[PDB]
């Protein structure tokens, strides 16, 4: 009974399929889904999905969160993201599938949906921010499970930035001009509090060969999370050779993952093993044993963990710097 249609109201092992109801709400043309919520994760983090059509206007007015670190991962389609810390140069990228944008506390930001089939996976730390979407949004029954329908919010940690003007000199999906976006490697900001972007496949990667091949592409480490105390990355996986036992994991902090590509089998606690496909999400409470392996010859998941030393950091630590998005051809 691992599978649920809305995130549970208390911490427990669960899997929720892509486009499940997930307390769906709409905000104009956008449809939000809350795969993992405050209640659901013990307030460790929120993992939500936003589906939306092209829009000629910003999806939200510029604003800041003082207590929440926000992460934007493009599942598909595309959306532009703007960000600025203090008086540092304003940054903007157009994110396509697999691209990532990091938005720390106190960073002014906004976004705009570009493509007709756009999906933004949002990871917010800590959890509970979603209350704002319940409040400002309109409930959506969404019977068919269709992806989307064809200055007063300080209480909700939303602080307006009405002076902020989103730059309009974007060329080749980025601005300012002296940036690298899909044309060279990207690094995680070394300065805490600064926003940064990693184009799909262009960031640092680490190969782990302890249990078949796994490639971790870090998005947020301790360096960036500081006191928010979490890590975020993608983990690409080979199959597990028959001569390797699939390891059993346990971590103090809750963790979760959304499959982006492939077929991943997860077994959590005393629940039956379940195979996840695109956009499917698995949530594992802290201190609960879990095993996972890829049935597909190559899978890739978006992974979030509460704590400084969860699964992704563990695989990196037991691994090595790696230059490719593909793993070795030989075991």
Ligand X SMILES: *[C@@H]1O[C@H](CO)[C@@H](O)[C@H](O)[C@H]1NC(C)=O
Ligand Y SMILES: *[C@@H]1O[C@H](CO)[C@@H](O[C@@H]2O[C@H](CO)[C@@H](O)[C@H](O)[C@H]2NC(C)=O)[C@H](O)[C@H]1NC(C)=O
Ligand Z SMILES: *[C@@H]1O[C@H](CO)[C@@H](O[C@@H]2O[C@H](CO)[C@@H](O[C@@H]3O[C@H](CO)[C@@H](O)[C@H](O[C@H]4O[C@H](CO)[C@@H](O)[C@H](O)[C@@H]4O)[C@@H]3O)[C@H](O)[C@H]2NC(C)=O)[C@H](O)[C@H]1NC(C)=O
Q: Which of 98, 218, 307, 319 binds ligand X (CB under 6 A)?
A: 307
Query: How are beta strands 205-208 and 264-268 bridged, if at all?
Result: unpaired
Q: Which of 95, 120, 284, 288 binds ligand KOJ (CB under 6 A)?
A: 120
Per-residue contact track with ligand Y, 71 to 90, x per CB under 6 A? Answer: ---------x----------
- Whether residue 109 lies in the annotated active site: yes
Q: What is d(CA 142, CA 24) in angstroms, rounded to the nearest whole number?
A: 8
Q: Which residue out of 65, 68, 119, 130 is catalytically annotated?
A: 65
Q: Are 116 and 55 in contact (CB under 8 A)?
A: no
Chain residue at closest Cβ approach to ligand KOJ: 50
Burial of 132 (0-12, 13-18, 19+ CB in 10 A): middle
The total of other beta-carbon atoms located within 10 Å of residue 311's CB is: 24
Q: What is d(CA 8, CA 6) in angstroms, rounded to the nearest whole number?
A: 6
Count of alpha carbons within 13 angstroms of residue 122, beta-carbon side: 27
Applying the rule CB under 5 A, the residues between 59 and 98 that interact with Cu ion are: 70
> Reduced to 3 states, what is the DSSP secondary structure of residue 144?
coil
Residue 171 CB, nearest distance to ligand Y (Å)?
A: 5
Residue 58 CB, nearest distance to ligand KOJ (Å)?
A: 10
Per-residue contact track with its own copies, 169 to 198, x per CB under 8 A? Answer: --xxx--------x----------------
Contact of residue 241 among ligand Z, its own copies, ligand Y, none (CB under 5-8 Å per partner type):
its own copies
Q: Determine if 19 is a binding residue for its own copies (CB under 8 A).
A: yes
Q: What residues have CB less than 8 Å from 314, skipping those under 6 apart?
A: 249
> Reduced to 3 states, what is the DSSP secondary structure of residue 227?
helix
Q: Which of 171, 190, 272, 329 binds ligand Y (CB under 6 A)?
A: 171
Judged by the rule CB under 6 A, the positions of this chain that interact with ligand Z are 80, 94, 168, 170-172
Judged by the rule CB under 5 A, the positions of this chain that interact with Cu ion are 70
Cite the active site residues. 63, 65, 70, 109
């Amino acid at each position: 009974s691992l599978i649920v249609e809305d995130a549970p109201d208390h911490v427990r092992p669960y899997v929720i399929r892509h486009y499940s109801h997930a307390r769906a709400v709409t905000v104009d043309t956008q449809l939000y889904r809350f795969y993992v919520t405050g209640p659901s994760s013990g307030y460790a983090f929120t993992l939500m999905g936003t589906n939306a059509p092209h829009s000629d206007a910003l999806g939200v007015l510029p604003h800041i969160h003082q207590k929440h670190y926000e992460n934007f991962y493009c599942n598909k389609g595309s959306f532009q993201l703007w960000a600025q810390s203090g008086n540092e140069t304003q940054q903007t990228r157009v994110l396509s599938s697999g691209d990532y944008g990091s938005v720390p506390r106190n960073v002014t930001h906004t976004f705009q949906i570009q493509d007709p089939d756009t999906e933004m996976t949002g990871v917010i730390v800590p959890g509970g921010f979603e209350d704002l979407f319940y409040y400002l949004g309109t409930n959506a029954t969404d019977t068919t499970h269709t992806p989307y329908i064809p200055s007063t919010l300080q209480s909700f940690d939303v602080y307006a930035e009405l002076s902020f003007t989103p730059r309009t000199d974007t060329v080749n999906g980025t601005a300012p001009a002296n940036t690298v976006w899909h044309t060279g490697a990207n690094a995680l900001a070394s300065t805490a509090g600064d926003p940064y972007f990693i184009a799909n496949g262009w960031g640092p990667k680490y190969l782990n060969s302890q249990y078949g091949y796994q490639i971790v592409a870090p998005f947020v480490t301790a360096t960036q999370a500081q006191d928010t105390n979490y890590t975020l990355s993608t983990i690409s996986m080979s199959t597990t050779p028959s001569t390797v036992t699939v390891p059993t994991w346990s971590f103090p902090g809750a963790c979760a993952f959304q499959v982006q590509e492939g077929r991943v089998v997860v077994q959590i606690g005393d629940y039956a093993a379940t195979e996840l496909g695109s956009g499917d999400v698995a949530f594992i409470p802290g201190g609960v044993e879990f095993k996972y392996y890829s049935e597909a010859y190559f899978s890739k998941v978006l992974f979030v963990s509460s704590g400084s030393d969860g699964l992704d950091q563990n695989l990196v630590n037991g691994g090595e710097e790696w230059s490719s998005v593909s793993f070795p051809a030989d075991w």
